[PDB]
């Protein structure tokens, strides 16, 4: 099937927190600090 | 006019797809003008900080100590100075913090174990040239832009002419696209350039995946060149990140990825092996004919030569 293929493509090429500009979410101090 | 060639880029996330496209604009176009380079100044600063933070956080999850107990505060400073700075703004204090952290032996020890967690392959690049990036009059070199990592908004397409041919290179990056959009990419595609990150052989698999990027890539590549609907579509293999693979093969044996491998831990013998693992997935020794290439997507000189070779192959098939 082609659906299976498209599905596979979507999950394999699917993108995280290291793209674009900064976000207030990426600036949260890790727990050990 | 003459002829028009349609190319489609496939390959798992972080395999070098977007990089290849950005290479074409540099090689077979006008590249990035001084002005265009200034636009990425913001994202360059970002990726840099995003990388160092990624390593620091790893130190907590891997239970790694700092080489110098003084760096502890700097780590805190990092998030504060980064929580407080902005775009197009690089304080000498922030760069100093990032720099000292990037030097710390403990941080390095973590950086060396970057296989045990997810980390971009532009980290070392920027973190090394920090002194240059930090400069006030700093303007991102053409190679810098090449290394930038931005949010892929849907499907990208780049036009360019090379050897009297009109190339249209498509790349669906990250954006989950519906069955409909995909069809329009596979249709009329002169050749598929499937990209594989060689350095993904020794990575510790995620907690949500059932194998690993390498095998995932193999499973993907399999269905691709074995799908009857792609019969007339020429398959081109781009074993990418050869440079990183070479540095990894020194300390990380290929056995971690392919247990049944009884060859020596050399770049030459291992890379040849990986190629075979992919090419052997082609259940058409007679019909299909895979064109493999060992590339470094960030190396312009390389890419230029590789693509030139690819071009000829396409012209020949007439
Ligand atoms: N050292 C090295 N780095 C690479 C190579 N190819 C890609 N990268 C880096 O990997 C990062 C992500 O690659 P990218 O093209 O965005 O992956 P994709 O778009 O998901 O296919 C980029 O920022 C590049 O700097 C390579 O051949 N060698």
Author numbering:
A (entry chain C): 496 to 510, 513 to 530
B (entry chain A): 30 to 347
The authors write:
G protein-coupled receptors (GPCRs) convert extracellular signals to intracellular responses, primarily by stimulating guanine nucleotide exchange on heterotrimeric G-protein Gα subunits. Upon receptor-stimulated exchange of GTP for GDP, Gα subunits undergo a conformational change, dominated by three mobile switch regions, resulting in separation of Gα from the obligate Gβγ heterodimer. Gα signaling is terminated by intrinsic hydrolysis of bound GTP to GDP, a reaction accelerated by ‘regulators of G-protein signaling’ (RGS proteins), and reversion of the Gα switch conformation to the inactive, GDP-bound state. Gα·GDP can then re-assemble a heterotrimer with Gβγ or, in the case of the Gαi/o subfamily, engage GoLoco motif proteins that are also selective for the inactive Gα state.
However, unlike the G42V mutant of Gα subunits, the G42R mutant retains normal GTP hydrolysis kinetics. Positioning of Gln-204 for hydrolysis may be possible if the Arg-42 side chain adopts an alternate rotamer. We also crystallized Gαi1(G42R)·GDP in complex with the GoLoco motif from RGS14 and derived an independent structural model at 2.8 Å resolution. In one of the two monomers of the asymmetric unit, Arg-42 adopts such an alternative rotamer that would allow Gln-204 to orient the nucleophilic water for hydrolysis. The structural model of Gαi1(G42R)·GDP bound to the GoLoco motif of RGS14 has provided a snapshot of an alternative Arg-42 rotamer that would indeed allow Gln-204 to access the orientation necessary for GTP hydrolysis. However, this rotamer still is expected to perturb the activated conformation of switch 3. We conclude that rotameric flexibility at Arg-42 allows the G42R mutant to retain GTPase activity while preventing appropriate active state switch conformations. Gα(G42R) mutants do not engage the active state-selective peptide KB-1753 nor RGS domains with high affinity, but instead favor interaction with Gβγ and GoLoco motifs in any nucleotide state. Our crystal structure models of Gαi1(G42R) indicates that this perturbed conformational flexibility is likely due to steric hindrance and electrostatic repulsion between the mutant Arg-42 side chain and residues of the switch regions.
